[PDB]
Amino acid sequence: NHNLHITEKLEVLAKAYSVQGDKWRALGYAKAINALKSFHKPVTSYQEACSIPGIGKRMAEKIIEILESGHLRKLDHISESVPVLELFSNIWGAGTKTAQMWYQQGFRSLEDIRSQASLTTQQAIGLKHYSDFLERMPREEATEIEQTVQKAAQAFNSGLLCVACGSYRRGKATCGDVDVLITHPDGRSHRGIFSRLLDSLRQEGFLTDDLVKGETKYLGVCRLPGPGRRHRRLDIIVVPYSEFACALLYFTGSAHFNRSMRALAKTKGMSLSEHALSTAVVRNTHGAKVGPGRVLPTPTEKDVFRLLGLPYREPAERDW
DNA sequence: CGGCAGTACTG
DNA sequence: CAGTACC
DNA sequence: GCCG
Ligand SMILES: [Mn+2]
Ligand SMILES: [Mn+2]
Ligand SMILES: [Mn+2]
Ligand code: NA
Ligand code: NA
User: Fold this and answer.
1) Which CATH number fits domain A81-134: 1.10.150.20, 3.30.430.20, 3.40.50.2000, 1.10.645.10?
2) Active centre residues of A (catalytic)
3) How many angstroms is C1' of C4 away from CA of A45?
4) I want to staple A239 with a disulfide (CB 3.0 to 4.6 A). Which of A20, A149, A247, A300 is the partner?
5) Residue ranges covered by each domain of chain A
6) In Å, what is the separation between the CA of A22 and the C1' of C4?
7) CA-to-CA separations, A6 to A15, A27, A65, A240, in angstroms, rounded
8) Would the annotation count A178 as a binding residue?
9) Smallest Cα–Cα separation from A130: which of A85, A91, A82?
């Protein structure tokens, strides 16, 4: 915000490290970029840079070069491959390893990929919907998608609870996809739904492509009827009722919020996953060596916060 | 030095 | 298994 | 990359 002239430079590096496979450096840049954006003032010195959590020696140095000097030496030394690697890894189902392999084999455009690359089933779908999957939808369309899933699920069993999570539940104006979470208060009737539910959503022509079909998670592609509609990513997760609060929290995110909550859980000798909050977990030197611990009862998202000794945060307040 | 998350599909 | 993906 |  006050330092976008710094963060604009740093995000180019962050992206370059990401698509090249250096996930840890990329994580460090992403965190520092979020810290600099959230800051209350323009950073104007080295020791002020060091003041911020997430900015250490090397990041402060780069912020210092940006100031006064106006640019960053390293940006001029980013491999010419990065834009192509970004292009390739924006195919759903292709990550850094696949993108680098394609690059090594001589492929430089999606036309090369289309005409010469061997593609997995998922990657052919990702390529078929390449532009669509880079578009975010208006949240009103996320609502229509959630209600389509809900109506199809509640026709099989009216007791099923269905909730769109992710960025939708965090109140965002646009959504990259729809994350639909399904449970049943009876603790049992959630099981074996996908056979009927997915077949039902196919009958409409609503489901257009399947990317992942598991016993508890479906990842695929839908499209609402009528003209002017794009293909949209749809994820559906079925969970036992006892896990509903932790799944609500995890799949609402954001990813950084979840990461921050896992770190806090660790400081308290606990662990937090999409399935449960666990206590008296045993670490040896930050590594969970032994001590899986015990699952704590968490009927509500509020209980997770309370058991972590934290004040409750509405989903809109988790958009980190 | 070494964690920075666990969970699940695919092939 | 490695790779990719979910937040 | 950061940080304990
Ligand atoms: Mn989402
Ligand atoms: Mn999703
Ligand atoms: Mn389309
Ligand atoms: Na710092
Ligand atoms: Na991808």
Assistant:
1) 1.10.150.20
2) 62
3) 40
4) A247
5) 4-76, 81-134, 137-244, 245-317
6) 15
7) 15, 17, 10, 45
8) yes
9) A91
